[PDB]
Design a protein around this nucleic acid. Structure first.
Ligand code: MG
Ligand code: MG
Ligand code: MG
Ligand code: MG
Ligand code: MG
Ligand code: MG
Ligand code: MG
Ligand code: MG
Ligand code: MG
Ligand code: MG
Ligand code: MG
Ligand code: MG
Ligand code: MG
Ligand code: MG
Ligand code: MG
Ligand code: MG
Ligand code: MG
Ligand code: MG
Ligand code: MG
Ligand code: MG
Ligand code: MG
Ligand code: MG
Ligand code: MG
Ligand code: MG
Ligand code: MG
Ligand code: MG
Ligand code: MG
Ligand code: MG
Ligand code: MG
Ligand code: MG
Ligand code: MG
Ligand code: MG
Ligand code: MG
Ligand code: MG
Ligand code: MG
Ligand code: MG
Ligand code: MG
Lengths: 151, 129, 144, 155
RNA sequence: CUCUAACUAUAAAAAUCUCUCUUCUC
RNA sequence: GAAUCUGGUCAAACUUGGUCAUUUAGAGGAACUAAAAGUCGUAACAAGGUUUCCGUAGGUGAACCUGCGGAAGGAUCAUUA
RNA sequence: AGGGGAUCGAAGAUGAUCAGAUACCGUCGUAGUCUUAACCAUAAACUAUGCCGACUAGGGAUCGGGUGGUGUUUUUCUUAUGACCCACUCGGCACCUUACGAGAAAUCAAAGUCUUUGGGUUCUGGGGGGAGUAUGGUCGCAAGGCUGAAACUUAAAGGAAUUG
RNA sequence: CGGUAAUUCCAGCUCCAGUAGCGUAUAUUAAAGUUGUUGCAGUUAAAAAGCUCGUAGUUGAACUUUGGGUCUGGUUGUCCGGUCCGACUUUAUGUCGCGCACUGGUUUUCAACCGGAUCUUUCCUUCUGGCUAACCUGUACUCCUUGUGGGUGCAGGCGAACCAGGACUUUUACUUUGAAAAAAUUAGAGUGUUCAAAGCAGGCGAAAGCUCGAAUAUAUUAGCAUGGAAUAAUGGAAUAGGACG
RNA sequence: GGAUAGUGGCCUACCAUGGUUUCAACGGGUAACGGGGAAUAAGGGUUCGAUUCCGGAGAGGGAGCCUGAGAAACGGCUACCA
């Protein structure tokens, strides 16, 4: 209901169950979960994609429930963590897409406004990550190194 | 965004009390509400109340007996001296024959009279009577 | 609610914001700006000695008609010129123009009392002696 | 610091009134005098084994520490041999029963024995005056890094 | 205890106004 | 060991300029207040006799009026008769 | 500034009305109205209700999504869709009834949870005029916008409702 | 108010208020919840930026030892112990009274009402020596009715009952206590300056010199020392470069 | 290094480029000496503090200095200005 950039007050989300431990009917092994997680990561799918695919295809509810640890942490321990966190990278991708659209057709002004919103969000998130020190303290997002990080 | 969960708890309490209800659902349910309600209950404004686990922040549901009249929270938890206690008692409580200013002490959560007999004083939380 | 800050560490604004809103009270603005020292020929003085020039009659407003016997005077302390009122019945002909007269306030904190437009001040002492002393036949004008 | 050959400028920096005899048949390094400043503060090893001079070093020089002891954070390093420490604190305005953030900037003098980076928190000590604004010497860099301890991440 | 059908069609011009305002107590 | 005298040094002052600040006339011009029995009209309050009001632009002795967008504080809370 | 140039119409031209009417009605008609890049940044830019939170009362519909029907017609024999009916739920513009809350009231389901005075927060006002005027800045080519008084002058101006 | 019946001017007579004081004027304070931190309003009465983003500022979710058991120090009210107070009066005992006017145990419960030490997979900086303060010592052995009631007594070894040196000290904000915050002023004790404003005096002998004093609190900010551990922030071990041996 | 009674850009020479600031620096006003305090009073505050006490500054304005432990003295000097 916050929705920083739009007065929308929705609460669309998920309520994960109360049982911290695994469901009683699950037959897969926590380790085998770990190896399939790592191989899908080798395929390149982001941990959100990893979670959704493991929920759709297999009895994987929450990898934290099963393996006792969370997907990004599994990747970090296994040394498959991306240099840029996925949500941030998606923000750069969206921002550069909007930038390309805007430069393509000038007069669109709501495009410019949404670009300002996206840059506000991306600066905010980068500030957070720098405080937690995931990013280098000199990591900066403006236009051109932005395009390089798009690659 | 929600800022002081204790204020929301007491606001729900006052709203549901004024309407004449008997039970209240406190949503965020942090330590301070629990201590507040034990102080309340041992004084008697509240009956046998209840905590609920939620794997996240829990919940409270509290029984009333209509004994209460009004509660409230002094959200900016002001630094009170051992002297300035009388100032708050005069400015908040109806009459010193009863009423209780609730403040956090080096001992812990505590009403004003307990604070004066223990000869300790800290930050003020709320006022009930 | 009550759209002023309430956190412990907000003190600054609660001061400076008040330090702004105080500029609304005219009393406070006059006191800090010292407008009583540039305008208002009494430089903060409750009394001043001036020299009378001419005796004038001033009309009154709508509900009240009468010729108020006012009097022009130039103040020694600054040289400015003001108009004053003679506060008893038979006292205009006590002024004896080109006379030292002591002017006081006029009962409304630098405003115009009642139905006498364009004046701000009483008259208390004429030729040293107080005017009410003359009007009570207790003392007499020196005529010097 | 004095940064690479303290014997740099037009004069000699000898530690005052100390003599190492060339005649000595040992060719020892030098008579590098020092003292324990007191107040339960340990002199750093680089203070003893160091090669700087720093007459204003509280550990090897002539200055002495007494009086006030402050705990601030380094905010400016750009000036030579000396540091600028920010002190943030609270001031109780009583008319509103409220608190007011305030900050002062105290200069101080860092011995070459100490490495300081911007953001460090420093225990500094009052001293006999050094300059127009300096009245303090740094005595203990508490957080040499603090959060800059780790620099990489390779599980 | 079963329902949702009618309907009309006018305008031109007209400005100003001298006083005198006065109590409720058994 | 004096007068005197070399150098600087602190340097108050002096002259001519510059600068800014304040008091200060200040030909004339534009106002504004109070002054209610001047004059020209009668815009507004009612559907004020062209519904008002806002922003913007134009012209006119004056209020004003007109255009373009607005708003109801409109004179309609309403046509699924 | 360049391009277009229908309509409609500030300015002007007109023919009426009137005492005057260079106003309202009536006809023509320039700039604009539409565009293309750049300035302008003001509107009664009004819901005259700042934003984020939690709670509090009854009723319906309506929009978007998602829920369950032994549901209906659908129609493609039958299932599938779609469209509907029901009971929902989450979010949105809103609405009706009421006060047991407020307000000074008009009224408000928030303008409630405020003397039984404390959820977090910005920005505004201190009688009316003078006056958004004087002056200095500052943006703009210009129009002007933001910032912004004082001297001085008054006992009112103003709000809502009541009866005439 | 006053324009021909003036309770408002101007006088006379009465009467009101304060009183050796009272009247003005300019300021300022309470009134003023009209500067609002406690404590203001923002639909139309003045006022919510046209809308959004955004640095500083401000504020910001919940959770990491709560319960229990004992002993025990006291402070309150219990039953009241001794002392004895009153109806009871010139004066004493008994009787009967507030159910004790002052000294007393408080395991008769009791109840608090703060504590302190303790055991709970529950540390209180913990060592390094002291000093052992202290007995788990147990040694020569009991001095004592036989009974550890109590003793002359020194090698391991009881450390908070205390010292005093290094090792480390996460940091605070906060809060309690103390030290400090000149006097004068304020407060406030005592005190017949004849009372009082005041003053810091005075009082008492039988006048033969013998004494009571000159009480105390506050200052809120910064600094210092100290007990506390809820609130509020900060901190660790994640590349293990982590702790103990 | 000089000079100080002594630390000190206090000053000089040679270096470096730093110092403070929207937590309000710098600048402007103060009919402002600061303070102990006074008026005011439910509580919270508002205003005043030239002056009986404590510090600071000055002896027409500025500068300079001898004596002396102590003065940049002023009922002590030197010079300029009024
Ligand atoms: Mg006429
Ligand atoms: Mg010479
Ligand atoms: Mg009209
Ligand atoms: Mg009209
Ligand atoms: Mg008409
Ligand atoms: Mg007409
Ligand atoms: Mg109307
Ligand atoms: Mg015509
Ligand atoms: Mg025309
Ligand atoms: Mg026309
Ligand atoms: Mg046409
Ligand atoms: Mg505007
Ligand atoms: Mg005004
Ligand atoms: Mg105006
Ligand atoms: Mg201007
Ligand atoms: Mg009205
Ligand atoms: Mg009469
Ligand atoms: Mg009379
Ligand atoms: Mg009051
Ligand atoms: Mg008001
Ligand atoms: Mg209006
Ligand atoms: Mg209005
Ligand atoms: Mg508005
Ligand atoms: Mg708005
Ligand atoms: Mg910020
Ligand atoms: Mg919290
Ligand atoms: Mg004192
Ligand atoms: Mg006294
Ligand atoms: Mg002062
Ligand atoms: Mg003073
Ligand atoms: Mg003095
Ligand atoms: Mg002097
Ligand atoms: Mg003189
Ligand atoms: Mg001598
Ligand atoms: Mg002198
Ligand atoms: Mg002298
Ligand atoms: Mg002399």
């Amino acid at each position: 209901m916050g929705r920083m950039h739009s007065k929308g007050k929705g609460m669309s989300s998920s309520a994960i169950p109360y049982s911290r431990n695994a469901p009683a009917w699950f037959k897969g092994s926590s380790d085998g979960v770990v190896e399939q997680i790592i191989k899908y990561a080798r395929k390149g799918l982001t941990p959100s994609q990893i979670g959704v695919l493991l929920r759709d295809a297999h009895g994987v509810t929450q990898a934290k429930v099963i393996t006792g640890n969370k997907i990004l942490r599994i990747l970090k321990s296994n040394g498959l963590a991306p240099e840029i966190p996925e949500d941030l990278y998606f923000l750069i991708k969206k921002a550069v897409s909007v930038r390309k659209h805007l430069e393509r057709n000038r007069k669109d002004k709501d495009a410019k406004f949404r670009l300002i919103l996206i840059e506000s969000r991306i600066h905010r998130l980068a500030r957070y990550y720098r405080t937690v020190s995931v990013l280098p303290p000199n990591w900066k997002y403006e236009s051109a190194t932005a395009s390089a990080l798009v690659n | 965004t929600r800022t002081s969960v204790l204020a929301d708890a007491l606001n729900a309490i006052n709203n549901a009390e004024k309407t004449g209800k008997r039970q209240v659902l406190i949503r965020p349910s942090s330590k301070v509400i629990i201590k507040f309600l034990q102080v309340m209950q041992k004084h008697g404004y509240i009956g046998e109340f209840e905590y609920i686990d939620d794997h996240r922040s829990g919940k409270i549901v509290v029984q009333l007996n209509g004994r209460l009249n009004k509660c409230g929270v002094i959200s900016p938890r002001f630094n009170v001296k051992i002297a300035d206690v009388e100032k708050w008692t005069a400015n908040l409580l109806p009459a010193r024959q009863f009423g209780y200013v609730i403040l956090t002490t080096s001992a812990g959560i505590m009403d004003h009279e307990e604070a004066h007999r223990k000869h300790v004083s800290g930050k003020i939380l709320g006022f009930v009577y | 609610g009550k759209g002023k800050p309430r956190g412990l560490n907000s003190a600054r604004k609660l001061r400076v914001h008040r330090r702004n809103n105080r500029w609304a009270e005219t009393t406070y603005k006059k006191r800090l700006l010292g407008t009583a020292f540039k305008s208002s020929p009494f430089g903060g003085s409750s009394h001043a000695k001036g020299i009378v020039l001419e005796k004038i009659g001033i009309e009154s407003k709508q509900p009240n008609s009468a010729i108020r016997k006012c009097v022009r005077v130039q103040l020694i302390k600054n040289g400015k010129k003001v108009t004053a009122f003679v506060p008893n019945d038979g006292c205009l002909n006590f002024v004896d123009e080109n006379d030292e007269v002591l002017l006081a306030g006029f009962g409304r904190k630098g405003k115009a009392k009642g139905d006498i437009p364009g004046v701000r001040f009483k008259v208390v002492k004429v030729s040293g002696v107080s005017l009410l002393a003359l009007w009570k036949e207790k003392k007499e004008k020196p005529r010097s | 610091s004095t940064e690479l050959t303290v014997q740099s400028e037009r004069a000699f920096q000898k530690q005052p009134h100390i003599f190492t005899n060339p005649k000595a048949k040992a060719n020892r390094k030098t008579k590098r005098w020092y003292k324990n400043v007191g107040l339960g503060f340990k002199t750093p090893k680089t203070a003893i084994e160091g090669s700087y001079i720093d007459k204003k070093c509280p550990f090897t020089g002539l200055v002495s520490i007494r009086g006030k002891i402050l705990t601030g954070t380094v905010v400016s390093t750009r000036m030579h041999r000396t540091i600028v420490i920010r002190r943030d604190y609270l001031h109780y305005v009583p008319k509103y029963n409220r608190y007011e953030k305030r900050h002062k900037n105290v200069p101080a003098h860092v011995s070459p024995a100490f490495r300081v980076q911007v953001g460090d928190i420093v225990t500094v000590g009052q001293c006999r005056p050094i300059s127009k604004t300096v009245r303090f010497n740094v005595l203990k860099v508490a957080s040499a890094t603090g959060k800059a301890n780790k620099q990489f991440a390779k599980f």
